[PDB]
Amino acid sequence: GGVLVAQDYRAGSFIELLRNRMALAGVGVRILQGLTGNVDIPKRTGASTMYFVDEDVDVTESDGAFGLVGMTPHTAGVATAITRRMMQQGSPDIEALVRDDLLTSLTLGLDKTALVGHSSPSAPNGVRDLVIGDALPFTGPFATFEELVDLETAVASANADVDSMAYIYNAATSGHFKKTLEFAGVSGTIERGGQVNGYNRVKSNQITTAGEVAFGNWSDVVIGMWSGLDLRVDTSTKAASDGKVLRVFTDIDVALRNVESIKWGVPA
Amino acid sequence: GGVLVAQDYRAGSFIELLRNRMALAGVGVRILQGLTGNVDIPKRTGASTMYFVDEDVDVTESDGAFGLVGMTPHTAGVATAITRRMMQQGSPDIEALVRDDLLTSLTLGLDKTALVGHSSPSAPNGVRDLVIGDALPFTGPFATFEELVDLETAVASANADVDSMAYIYNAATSGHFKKTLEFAGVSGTIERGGQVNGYNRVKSNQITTAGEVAFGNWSDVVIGMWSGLDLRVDTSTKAASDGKVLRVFTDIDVALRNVESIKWGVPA
Amino acid sequence: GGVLVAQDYRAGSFIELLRNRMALAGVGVRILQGLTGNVDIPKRTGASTMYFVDEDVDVTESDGAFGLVGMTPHTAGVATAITRRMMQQGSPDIEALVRDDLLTSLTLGLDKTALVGHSSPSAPNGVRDLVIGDALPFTGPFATFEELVDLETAVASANADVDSMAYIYNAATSGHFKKTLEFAGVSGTIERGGQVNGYNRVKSNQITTAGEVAFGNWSDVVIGMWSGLDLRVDTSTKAASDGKVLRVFTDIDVALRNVESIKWGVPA
Amino acid sequence: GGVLVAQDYRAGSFIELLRNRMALAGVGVRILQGLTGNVDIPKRTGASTMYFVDEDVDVTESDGAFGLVGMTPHTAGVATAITRRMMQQGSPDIEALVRDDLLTSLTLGLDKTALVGHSSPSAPNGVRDLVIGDALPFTGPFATFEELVDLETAVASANADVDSMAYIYNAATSGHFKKTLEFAGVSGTIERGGQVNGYNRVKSNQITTAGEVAFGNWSDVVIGMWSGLDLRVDTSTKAASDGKVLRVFTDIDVALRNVESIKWGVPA
Amino acid sequence: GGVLVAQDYRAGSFIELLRNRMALAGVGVRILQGLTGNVDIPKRTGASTMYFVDEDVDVTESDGAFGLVGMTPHTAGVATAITRRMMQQGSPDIEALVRDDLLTSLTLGLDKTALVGHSSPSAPNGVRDLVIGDALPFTGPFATFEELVDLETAVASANADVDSMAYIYNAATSGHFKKTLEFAGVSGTIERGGQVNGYNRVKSNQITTAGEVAFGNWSDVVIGMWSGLDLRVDTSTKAASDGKVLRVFTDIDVALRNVESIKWGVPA
Amino acid sequence: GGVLVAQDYRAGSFIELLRNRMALAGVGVRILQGLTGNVDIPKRTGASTMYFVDEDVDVTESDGAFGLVGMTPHTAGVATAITRRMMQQGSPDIEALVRDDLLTSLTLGLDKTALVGHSSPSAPNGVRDLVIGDALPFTGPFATFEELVDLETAVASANADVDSMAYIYNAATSGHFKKTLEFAGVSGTIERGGQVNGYNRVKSNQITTAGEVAFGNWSDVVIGMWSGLDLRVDTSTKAASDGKVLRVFTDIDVALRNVESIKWGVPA
Amino acid sequence: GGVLVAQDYRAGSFIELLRNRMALAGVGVRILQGLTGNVDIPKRTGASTMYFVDEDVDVTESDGAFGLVGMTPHTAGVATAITRRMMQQGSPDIEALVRDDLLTSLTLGLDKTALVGHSSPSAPNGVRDLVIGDALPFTGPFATFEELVDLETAVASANADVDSMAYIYNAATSGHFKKTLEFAGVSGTIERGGQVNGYNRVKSNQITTAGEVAFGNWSDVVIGMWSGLDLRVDTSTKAASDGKVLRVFTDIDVALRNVESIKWGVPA
């Protein structure tokens, strides 16, 4: 009764405790809303000037400029297919395994494209696209403690400070900020406790680049969600040879109130 | 039924969230007064000299010098216009917007001139205009911690010492005072907990220069007011088009008592 | 007379306080299960992707991939003999001595074989056997504080980090961590107060080599025990002279779900 | 019309808040007395010595020297003259201003010349004149902690060390003291809050030189007042114009008991 | 007529304040008991070995190894004899003195020979002799900190670690520890406070050599007291000439459990 | 009427506030007595050895030695002469001055020669005289922290230590201890606070040389005070000029009981 | 009032009971089941052997061999369309009328391909496809009695015999058997009543070819129903003209448990 070829009763047990995928993290500081129709908010962007004048000499007329920000829904959506046989024989089921998979793969996609601009036309330009025009280099594969304060000045130099800001960087950067001394010979390091420079960090892997770090007042970043999550189940699109496709849509747009409330550093 | 046309009914939602353009922050620790006429205050600038003399020899006569400090009203004001159609259909009250912007841009405009002398003639002389005659250089883009002690001495050396002095430096400089140690590996940075060298700072953004830093007893500068912020709402002008014009005037002047009570930084 | 010879009725005492074996210590922070037949676990190893489209544009269908992990029993056993006379006249009860020897000499063998694979060809593949392909050399007889956090970032980069992870290193390596500072001039040593980098250490001797360390989320491995520790008395093998032979068998195997949850040190 | 040579009724508002002159400070730790005649007080120098002898072996004799210190009035005073018209039309009381100038400008002059000797014949010998003979160099534009404690030992090495002792140095030297550590790497400045090397300081401006600093028990300086301040009013002099003259006189002399109670260090 | 020679009638005063000798300290950690006959206690020295079998392959039997440690009374004596005259003329009570000098000397001799083996045959084998076989050299007159934690690791690499272990070293070594730092440029000495490396120390001079330091769990050494210290004053031995002879006997033996529970470091 | 020959009337004031000669300090930790005739005390200096015997072997009798330590009074005195006129016209009472000088000049000489041996035959052996053979050089002008702890080590290395000890060093040595670090990195000075190495310190210029320093249990030094401070007024020594002479005698000697209770520094 | 255009009273009777298609005959003797997921069944092959031992002989061991048979689901289905008009004017409920058309035409089609394999890829191989590897030629258009009894003997020799077997042939071969003798001059015909050789026949036209005759136990054919015959009404396709489409699907597979239980004729 050797187990080799004459006792091949041993088959697969197939315990259904699925090893699920590893997913990234998100953000928790910004603001949002649910609405309909186009939206526009007025912006000041201009102020009157002061004139010093002699006696009996007339002053002039100075008038402020104006402008308005706007948001229009750009739709997004993921869709997948399931043939008949897969539907017939799915061990954890295919009607429910793929269902939540779609939602969890779309929520993170939206959260990523809101932060970093998705490289595709007809897609809402992300925050990194609206502020990369003044990217601060780091003259090194990573950022020293000097630059992490430079970013804070470049934001405070524009009078945009609410003393509740946050840094954002991936993990491979957070590693270097863990094993690097703050100064020449002083005790502390850069990323001690949960803070960095008195402000919090988030350590999210959404920013794919290695040494790319972002800072600024995230409170004035608005995102317009015109609709929730749809999760439309379909059968007719593939029914000649039986099959059931799944799909889910959502539309969104991103904009920020002041262009300089965020600073973006790029590792040179 | 696309949304390009044949769908001209999309509505531009208008939300009332006007945001004032970024503004600076003032600095008040000074001395002021409301009055009329020209003004004058006498000041002693000389003292007698003691003489040691032997038995029965005549002493010498020494005479002190005097001086006075004078101020005269300098005039400054701002104004702008509003037509009729703009006033009627305005989503926020355009009147209130202008009526607030004028006062804000004048209040902020005055003290900046008080610190840094305005570039136009017929404008009052700022503190920087008077004390820049002597000015300690810095031998670098920013001020090493030792120069911040040289300022405190150069005032103490003239025995103008009061125990409530304060530093004033640009916001962009304050970044250079948090990434720099006092001494090599000494465990303390320059600006700690909103204090420097045991004295307070203000960290205003009025000082438009990079590394200029002022210091001294600011209870020794005197500004002269002749009239508060007078808001003249004017409708007789442009009355043929029924468009009113708003204007505001105020006269000011500034001069400090002891020239050696302030010092300037002048990075070079 | 004297106590030299032929005057020896002096009692010889026999106290019952055994000196023990001085074995190693365990680990025990993992998960396990009881089985039958070969087991396979499904594991999702792909994700769908979103598509940004404007009005009236089809969304592309996208699909993920799947995979599964397997386990198969490998058997480990121990056995020993005992005669009748030893049982007849034993100073402590011998059969319990040998039973406890068997049990605690098999449990520790299994623990060691889990982490480091045993040498025999018919042996379960240890964690070191699996995750050694991704190995981070140390460029020295031990590891500095740099690499000792480099492991952490090489784990957390794959999003596979849970708040409660742990380090594992040989007992002859705890001492090196103790005698070395993290950075040059600052105070503080690596093995500091029962932890190393905010995470716990275990300091076992199962790791035979000198400077091998291992870090990762220790809830991501599974050991499959097909049968508990069963004890057989086996009186019949030596009934020709009434001799028992105690033996204990057990067959297990080990595997981990996500390969990027452990990191090996392997100093060079 | 506007301000013009023709239009100028505007008056000159004369506010009587006299900005005063910036004066120096003095000392508060010495002793003195109101006197007459000429004073000589004896002080012992040296004492007898101990001798060891054999049994019935002759003993020898010794002796102890003596000495005395003396003080003689040195006369000093200041005086100025005000005309007649300037008393007729004077905005404050022109007399009282001159009186309160003379009194303080004489008190400070005497306190100045007592500490550091005045540079003129017929002037009393200041402490610097009496103790500069054994002055201690510095080998630097300023003094270092080594000398800041050598000044302490050089007083202790003469048994003249007493519990109450104080440092005295120019205000320009205090800033330098602050901007310099005590040792190489330790975190500590020379002058902490109101303390130097466990002792007090006064930090006046009387010491005209930068690097000079004095130390020692200041209870050994004795100054003698032969007469209070006179403040005599003259009218016979300058009577052809009815002009008053104000004079003050005082005689004084300074001498310290034990020459080693003070130590004086000069920069070099 | 003199004091020196042939006129010396002065009596030489005798004061009974005996200046005693100087003694050592001892040890206070280990365990002991009181017994009558020989004592043997059993310890296991060998365990079964695990095995992995190819399918259908018999597991081989593995047998443990046993041993036992024994203690036999080794007897000591200490005796001295005072004579009659020395007892008739004695300023302190001489037999009250020698009786103390015997007890203290015997206690300290037993203590010293228990720790360091006495250099004589028929003397119980001291702790040092059981572990001096393997000994960690120090490469210098004393052991630095890294060399000091090697004793910790050596016991740790034998699984014999207990929560309360201790260090023992000469008093001359305790100097070389109190005056040397743990790490260069860090504020910490080796023999800090009252502990070393987080473990207790006991300073004693029993270790006659210079830099030998011992370490290990001292609760693992046992010592046997067959009979306490007995005075046993004797007269009839030296009775021919009257005398009082004193002799104190005691018989003990020392033995160790886990040889690895003690590590010995010799300077070289 | 100027102050010259024409003004010789002004007198010469004599004030009786004399100044005492600044003296040294003493000692407050030793022990002494008042006695007559020679003195000596017995000191045990031998320990009875022990032996390990065989089964039936007699312990070999052994003996201890005894030592006797004693002292003999040495003499010492001082004397100063007064003439007749200087006694007739003395501004303070001259005999009072010399009688209050002699007693102190003798006490401070007795203590001086007790601590440090006088350099003259027929003078008592000072504590320096008895321990200078066991001196410990300093390889420099002053001693570092290493030798400062080395003295304490070499004292306690002879079982002669007790909790109440003290250092003694010249004022200059104290100043040097104040100006240096024990380890360059560590904060604090050799003379931090009132202690030096956990024990007290007393400084006094009695020790004449630069960096000699002593340490050890000071309650181990006895002083023999045979006679008080004998005062003698001698008028007949020189009556040919009617001039008396004052003499003061006192006999003393010093010895220490346990010789290894002190050690000396002798900076090489 | 005859039956012409004069009489319009008569209407179309249209009795609803439908006629039917001339469909072939099935089998209905075999086995089936309902399952899910890929399948296999463990069969046996060979067994142990019996041994006749003497009085005291041990009986020996013979190994048993094993093996399995698996099946994979092949798919099939039919579908036809229905216009909107034909659902309004259908005299029976048209969908209920077209269902039966689809279910019977599918069941019969499955019976066809199961017995004789469909000539198309992706079609489950029929019984003829599995056993035709060995079949007795006939040497003529049909088979005599000898071959029809050899078909029985070749199965009975393999012990695959069971009483309820059956022949199968095409209607034409049955007619031929009816019109011919078993042997020349023998009254009995090859086929008579319901038997051919004492066993039953089925006389179906599923075997399209002429002359092929199959024999064997038809209780060894196993077919696997992976899903009931599900009905899918489709309305999304052809939804412009409102026409709906009916569809039906199923997944089956055929495999016989004992390959030698059937034989085939295959004339020539």
Author numbering:
A (entry chain D), B (entry chain E), C (entry chain C), D (entry chain A), E (entry chain G), F (entry chain F), ...: 24 to 291
How do the authors describe this structure?
We recently characterized a novel roseophage, vB_DshS-R4C (R4C), that could infect the Dinoroseobacter shibae DFL12T, a ubiquitous group of Gram-negative α-proteobacteria of the Roseobacter clade.
Using these data, we sought to determine the cryo-EM structure of the R4C capsid head, resolved to an overall resolution of 3.63 Å by cryo-EM single-particle analysis. The R4C capsid shell exhibits a T = 7 quasi-icosahedral lattice with a largest diameter of ~664 Å. The capsid comprises 415 copies of the MCP (vBDshSR4C_006), organized into 11 penton vertexes and 60 hexons. The atomic models of the MCPs within one asymmetric unit containing one hexon plus one pentameric monomer were then built. Through structural superimposition, we find that the overall structure of the R4C MCP is highly similar to HK97 gp5 despite a low sequence identity. Similar to the canonical HK97-fold, the R4C MCP is composed of a long N-terminal arm (N-arm), an axis domain (A-domain), a periphery domain (P-domain), and an extended loop (E-loop). Superimposition of six copies of the hexameric MCP monomer shows conformational heterogeneity, with structural variations primarily located on the E-loop and the N-arm, which contributes to accommodate the deferent radius at deferent location of the capsid shell. A hierarchical network of penton-hexon and hexon-hexon interactions mediate the assembly of the R4C capsid. The penton-hexon interactions are mediated primarily by the two anti-parallel N-arms from neighbouring capsomers; these types of interactions are also observed in hexon-hexon interactions. Unlike the covalently cross-linked chain present in the capsid of HK9737, or the formation of an additional (decoration) protein to stabilize the capsid shells found in phage BPP-141, TW140 and Mic38, the R4C capsid is assembled by non-covalent, inter-capsomeric interactions without any additional decoration.
